[PDB]
Design a binder for this molecule. Structure first.
Ligand code: CA
Ligand code: CA
Length: 97
């Protein structure tokens, strides 16, 4: 009885853009509190996080966080993929019919 829908992709940050040395995606201004979140690599969007092999955080409280230094590599090499997220948002059933 809760009408749920997945948002469009959000991709506002990039691993070599901004000042965070990583990729963070938020659902602020899209959903108040998402029921679920889907985090995918831009270049390989069919691969779930379980198939992707990076060290990231993806959850319904903080959204998506990847820190470049957490990724495989040595010296200056190795960083986050660029990620995008959808959020699953739910509303009363009377908003679906
Ligand atoms: Ca960045
Ligand atoms: Ca991104």
């Amino acid at each position: 009885a809760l009408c749920c829908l997945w948002s469009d992709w959000i991709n506002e940050d990039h691993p070599s853009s901004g000042s965070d040395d990583g990729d963070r995606e938020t659902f602020d201004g899209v959903c108040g509190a998402p029921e679920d979140i889907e985090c995918r690599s831009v270049k390989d969007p069919h691969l779930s996080l379980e198939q992707l092999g990076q060290k990231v955080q993806c959850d319904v409280s903080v959204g998506f966080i990847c820190k470049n230094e957490d990724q495989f590599g040595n010296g200056p090499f190795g960083l986050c993929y660029d990620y995008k997220i959808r959020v699953n948002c739910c509303w009363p059933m009377d908003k679906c019919a």
